[PDB]
Amino acid sequence: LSADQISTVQASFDKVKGDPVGILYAVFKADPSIMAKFTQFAGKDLESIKGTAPFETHANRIVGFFSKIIGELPNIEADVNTFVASHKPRGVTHDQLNNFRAGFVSYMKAHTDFAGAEAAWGATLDTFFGMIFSKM
Numbered sequence: 001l002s003a004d005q006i007s008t009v010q011a012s013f014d015k016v017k018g019d020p021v022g023i024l025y026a027v028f029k030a031d032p033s034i035m036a037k038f039t040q041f042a043g044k045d046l047e048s049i050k051g052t053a054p055f056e057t058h059a060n061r062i063v064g065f066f067s068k069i070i071g072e073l074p075n076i077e078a079d080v081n082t083f084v085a086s087h088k089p090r091g092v093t094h095d096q097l098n099n100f101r102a103g104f105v106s107y108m109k110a111h112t113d114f115a116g117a118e119a120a121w122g123a124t125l126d127t128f129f130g131m132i133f134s135k136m
């Protein structure tokens, strides 16, 4: 993960970072078992909560932290440590993590011309999830 790839990803993310709700929607739609871990959304129709205030509040938190991580590549270890600390006790599985990745990438492909940033995003996400999976 070098500066050329980091700059490509950060340019790519800048286009979409203003649509937190859309990104979270994509992730929940890829794997409903992620959605079911939230007391505030469990048992509701995703299409119905997508536009409510609680969804936006959450979306802003999660994508806000992801935005931190993208902004500081590649010095992400301390933040991944924090993530593992808050999430390992909620029983997040590798399957769910991989579906989050799949949902995010699906979002990016449906909303930008992804083809030019694909390999850079690959390197970034392989590095990120590579670190998470070594800790939980």
Ligand code: HEM
Residues within 6 Å of the ligand: 033, 034, 037, 038, 058, 061, 062, 063, 065, 066, 083, 086, 087, 090, 092, 096, 097, 100
């Ligand atoms: C895909 C598996 C994941 C599951 C099952 C999951 C689950 C949760 C749950 C249950 C909460 C608490 C919501 C609340 O009580 O209000 C939460 C919050 C949060 N999640 Fe995740 N999450 C996942 C992935 C991620 C990823 C990849 C990130 C990295 C950006 C992330 C960042 C956050 C942040 C920043 C919060 C708010 C602070 C906190 O409560 O921990 N989550 N998540």
Ligand SMILES: [C-]#N
Residues within 6 Å of the ligand: 062
């Ligand atoms: C966490 N989403």
